[PDB]
Amino acid sequence: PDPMKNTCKLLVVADHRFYRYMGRGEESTTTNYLIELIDRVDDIYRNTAWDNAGFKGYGIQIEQIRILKSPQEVKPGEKHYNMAKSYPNEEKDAWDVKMLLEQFSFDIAEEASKVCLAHLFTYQDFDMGTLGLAYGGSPRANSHGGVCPKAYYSPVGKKNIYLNSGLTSTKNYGKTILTKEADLVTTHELGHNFGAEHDPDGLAECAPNEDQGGKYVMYPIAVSGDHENNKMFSQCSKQSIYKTIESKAQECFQERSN
Ligand SMILES: CC(C)C[C@H](CC(=O)NO)C(=O)N[C@H](C(=O)N[C@@H](C)C(=O)NCCN)C(C)(C)C
Numbered sequence: 001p002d003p004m005k006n007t008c009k010l011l012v013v014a015d016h017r018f019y020r021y022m023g024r025g026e027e028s029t030t031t032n033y034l035i036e037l038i039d040r041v042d043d044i045y046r047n048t049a050w051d052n053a054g055f056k057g058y059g060i061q062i063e064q065i066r067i068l069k070s071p072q073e074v075k076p077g078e079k080h081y082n083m084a085k086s087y088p089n090e091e092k093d094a095w096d097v098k099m100l101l102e103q104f105s106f107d108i109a110e111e112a113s114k115v116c117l118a119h120l121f122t123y124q125d126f127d128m129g130t131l132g133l134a135y136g137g138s139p140r141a142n143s144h145g146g147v148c149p150k151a152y153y154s155p156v157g158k159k160n161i162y163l164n165s166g167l168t169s170t171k172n173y174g175k176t177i178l179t180k181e182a183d184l185v186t187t188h189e190l191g192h193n194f195g196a197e198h199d200p201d202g203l204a205e206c207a208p209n210e211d212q213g214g215k216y217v218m219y220p221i222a223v224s225g226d227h228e229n230n231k232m233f234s235q236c237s238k239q240s241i242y243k244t245i246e247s248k249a250q251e252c253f254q255e256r257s258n
């Protein structure tokens with residue numbers, strides 16, 4: 001592991017919902033929450049041996065936190081990830097999650113091109129229990145993204161956007177999720193960014209029963225995280241991430257800041 005290039009620097013964005021509902025309308029409260037969350041997630045990554053040997057010490061660090069204190073005013077017909085209304089259905093508490101990730105990537109393109117990853121933290125109740133979403137680590141045909149900006153020309157947006165993005169919501173079923181749960185959401189989404197796909201039931205090694213420590217972080221269904229494996233990456237995730245981690249590291253990782 002190149003100690004000069006072992007850290008994925010992040011642009012962390014807190015939208016107006018997060019600022020108000022998690023931040024208590026305060027910059028300090030907002031940033032402290034995020035700084036502490038990323039550092040705990042970093043502990044998970046940093047201590048992971050991607051090859052089950054000495055290939056460890058790779059992690060994440062915040063480069064900048066953008067704090068949006070109020071909604072983005074928009075003209076009629078125009079949309080922005082930080083606008084007051086949910087999209088496509090303004091009657092709902094939250095956006096459609098996929099459309100939100102696409103919108104965030106579009107609006108943040110200039111900034112995203114200069115960082116390893118951009119991550120949006122929001123506070124909206126996505127339909128049916130969804131907590132987050134990210135590019136990378138998806139089995140879908142022609143899907144791409146994850147660490148290090150990769151361009152995608154949006155025929156609808158008429159410009160290049162980058163696929164080095166993901167998002168976390170700390171609201172689910174009308175309540176703020178536990179910090180232990182939030183940590184797991186962000187870990188899972190960055191896991192996709194790093195190259196992991198969902199662990200399959202079909203491989204017991206990567207999806208243990210509850211008495212064998214429970215599921216690992218990349219399981220498709222969320223859990224509170226009281227089981228042993230919950231906060232760790234499975235061997236399946238490690239294998240996937242390891243195929244490209246070094247290469248990606250040479251591309252856009254930087255030196256850890258003490
Ligand atoms: C951190 C988690 C694992 C992220 C995933 C979505 C995903 O794979 N993002 O990369 C999620 O929101 N999972 C939901 C989830 O498990 N939520 C739990 C909290 C839930 O609602 N459980 C009971 C609802 N029947 C789904 C979509 C499976 C309902």
Ligand SMILES: [Zn+2]
Nearest residue numbers: 188192198220
């Ligand atoms: Zn997932």
